[PDB]
Amino acid sequence: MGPGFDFAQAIMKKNTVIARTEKGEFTMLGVYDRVAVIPTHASVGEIIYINDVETRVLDACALRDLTDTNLEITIVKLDRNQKFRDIRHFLPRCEDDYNDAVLSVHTSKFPNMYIPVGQVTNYGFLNLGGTPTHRILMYNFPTRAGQCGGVVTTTGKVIGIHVGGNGAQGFAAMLLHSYFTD
Ligand SMILES: O=C(c1cn[nH]c1)N1CCCC1
């Protein structure tokens, strides 16, 4: 509808796949080469389905901060025959608050879904499903089951992936440039 949705659409059309684990179907953001991200609660194993194709997980990693606190981001390297467009230059370098964000989802259940969630707070600490979690972004939209892994963007920035909600608010794990240095 506007330049927010334009940038979100550009990310969804080239940098997302549908990831299936034993814990369900997730939006999965591809970042560069064969490297993607997913919520740690997806419980990635040795094998994952990518757009309904059986794919070996060459490597995977559940990120924690230097206080050894959950970040709820898993970085996955896929045994896939094709690279993602490199979008690392759209990742923020520091923790921040944002205005006018869009949460975008693409699954079997929720194809081509875009939600204007408005103002994003650097919330910090959240007890997420009973797990102490750091670097949480908060937005005042009543998000629901099926949106986890959803991509949170502003015009020109990919800032996080959706990892939970409480019925009134939605929560995203930050994406930082420093997670994907090579
Ligand atoms: O930490 C990383 C990573 C992030 N950006 N590049 C590589 N990985 C661990 C699982 C496979 C990739």
Structure tokens at 36: 């993607």
25 and 8 both lie in a single domain: no
Alpha-carbon span 50 to 64, nearest angstrom: 25
104 and 89 both lie in a single domain: yes
C-alpha dihedral sign at 29, 31, 33, 38: negative
Residue 10, classified by CB atoms within 10 Å of its CB into exposed (0-12), middle (13-18) or buried (19+), is: middle
Residue 120, classified by CB atoms within 10 Å of its CB into exposed (0-12), middle (13-18) or buried (19+), is: buried
Resolution (A): 1.5
Identify residue 119 by its one-letter amino acid code: Q
Quote the ligand 1 centre to 3 CA distance (angstroms).
31
129 and 78 both lie in a single domain: no
Alpha-carbon span 34 to 86, nearest angstrom: 10
Quote the ligand 1 centre to 148 CA distance (angstroms).
20
Residue 163, classified by CB atoms within 10 Å of its CB into exposed (0-12), middle (13-18) or buried (19+), is: buried
- Ligand 1 atom nearest to CA at 77: 11
Structure tokens at 79: 């045994």
Domain count, the chain: 2
27 and 52 both lie in a single domain: yes
Alpha-carbon span 170 to 159, nearest angstrom: 14
110 and 122 both lie in a single domain: yes
Instruction: Give rounded-to-5 percent helix, strand, coil for the chain.
Output: 15, 55, 35
Domain extent for 163 = 1-15+85-182
- The 3-state DSSP class for residue 114 equals strand
Query: First CA to last CA across the chain, in angstroms?
Result: 36
The answer to whether 61 is a known catalytic residue is: no
CA distances, 1 to each of 12, 158, 169 (Å): 15, 18, 24
100 and 173 both lie in a single domain: yes
CA atoms within 13 A on the CB side of 153: 24
